[PDB]
């Protein structure tokens, strides 16, 4: 099993109100869904992500990164955030990413495509 | 199917001689190898993201994004990269993304633990 | 005078430890000095940058954006950091920031050249 | 004088077609005008940034960073660019730049308030 495959699988809230719930794997794989408290969202969107399965011993976080597809069963926002950032164990476990969320545009506005945001996620709250 | 489904699933090469193959899935699946022409990183890596299944028809891009984390039978380098961006059809197909790479840091080194780039993919080279 | 001229002067503490002395003129201007509490960095460094000296007054947050070159007569570490954010006023004013800290690299390096993160400033601690 | 001093002086061209127009100070200072071809921008904006007057001398770039603030005697977007990049001299010399464009918002829409995106400058078009 991963190192922290128990450490990271479960139900994690950020600073928004959103709500992360995933399921890490031996082999590094995140599977999950995502709810978002803001934006245009609503209900449980589909998420698929890796994490460093075998990550270092010297009180180092755990990469890992997940992607969300804002499409689900009631609306489709035509974008998609990516969070990358560690978990960090201990009596106070915490996620902590940094994350861009791209809309499709037309080529005229592709400038202004990409938010650029942080989330720190914890098992409480 | 997905209306991009066709026009994503394939070998994509980015700027830096690095290689994505992915295949698309109907429901908005995204899964397939990396492999890094730079870094700590060789062969092929396990990714997986999401896309936009059903994308705007008013000539905009499609939403998409992926992980790899950065350890296979190898290497690893205690790390993630997450891509965010709009694949654009067309002639001269691309994927146009900004990338965020975490690396599994102590506390006191957290602050330095994000690199941030841009790659662009296209079908040749 | 600047809306925020006077809430934005003076001297702001994030949450790395650092100190970032500034003084914002009536019509945009910021000027200042930088003290980071890490990296490779000592004492006082030149910065300067823009604020918005007419924000809106919907309670919306005063955008802002300001440049440190990390070399003074001490050390140079051949980087430059811009953070870009918004200040917030009340009783609990708040500088809220992401930054790019871009190094000098080589053509071959330019790839893992720039770190992103967020710093948050406080007038207390 | 700046190593690059010459070198960065003068007028610059993006991707977008606008305009970027410095002065390079011998200390390290950075001072000129700014205009975008794209956003709610017109004219000529004032800009303020630092560079590494002194830069490795192994083939690196040069690290620099300079703020625009959205308002001058036309217009108020309410909201600042910062970019964070090097300057690359030789034939066909460059700043490659990656930026951030903070808006001033409500705190209930913080989260949406920073773009990210990357430009070229180049000395032609
Ligand atoms: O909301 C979405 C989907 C929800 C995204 C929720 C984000 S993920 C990062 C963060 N952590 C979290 O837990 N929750 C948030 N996707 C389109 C995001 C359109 N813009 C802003 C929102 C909006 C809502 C309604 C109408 C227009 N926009 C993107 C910014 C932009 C740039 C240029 C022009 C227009 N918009
Ligand atoms: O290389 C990796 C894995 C390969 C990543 C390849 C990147 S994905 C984005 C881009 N598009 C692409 O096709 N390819 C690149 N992961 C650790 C990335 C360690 N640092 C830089 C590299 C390095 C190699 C050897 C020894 C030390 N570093 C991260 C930057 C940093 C910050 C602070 C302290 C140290 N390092
Ligand atoms: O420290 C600096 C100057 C200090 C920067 C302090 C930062 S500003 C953002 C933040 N808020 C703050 O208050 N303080 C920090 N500039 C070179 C930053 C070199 N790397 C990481 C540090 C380091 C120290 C010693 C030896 C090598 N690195 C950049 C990451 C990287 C990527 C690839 C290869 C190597 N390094
Ligand atoms: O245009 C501006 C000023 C011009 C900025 C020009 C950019 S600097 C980076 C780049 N390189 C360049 O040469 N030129 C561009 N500042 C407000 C930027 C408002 N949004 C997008 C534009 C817009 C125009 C009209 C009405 C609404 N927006 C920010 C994205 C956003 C997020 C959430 C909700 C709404 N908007
Ligand atoms: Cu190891
Ligand atoms: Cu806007
Ligand atoms: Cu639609
Ligand atoms: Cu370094
Ligand atoms: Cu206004
Ligand atoms: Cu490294
Ligand atoms: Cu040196
Ligand atoms: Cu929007």
Do not use: C
């Amino acid at each position: 099993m991963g190192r922290d495959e128990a450490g990271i699988t479960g139900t994690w809230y950020n600073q928004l109100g959103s709500t992360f719930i995933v399921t890490a794997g031996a082999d590094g794989a995140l599977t999950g869904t995502y709810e978002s408290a803001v934006g245009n969202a609503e209900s449980r969107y589909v998420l698929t992500g890796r994490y460093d399965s075998a990550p270092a011993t010297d009180g180092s976080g755990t990469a890992l990164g997940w992607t969300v597809a804002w499409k689900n069963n009631y609306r489709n926002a035509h974008s998609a955030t990516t969070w990358s950032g560690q978990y960090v164990g201990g009596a106070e476990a915490r996620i902590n990413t940094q994350w861009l969320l791209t809309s499709g545009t037309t080529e005229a506005n592709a400038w202004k495509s990409t938010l650029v945001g942080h989330d720190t996620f914890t098992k409480v709250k």
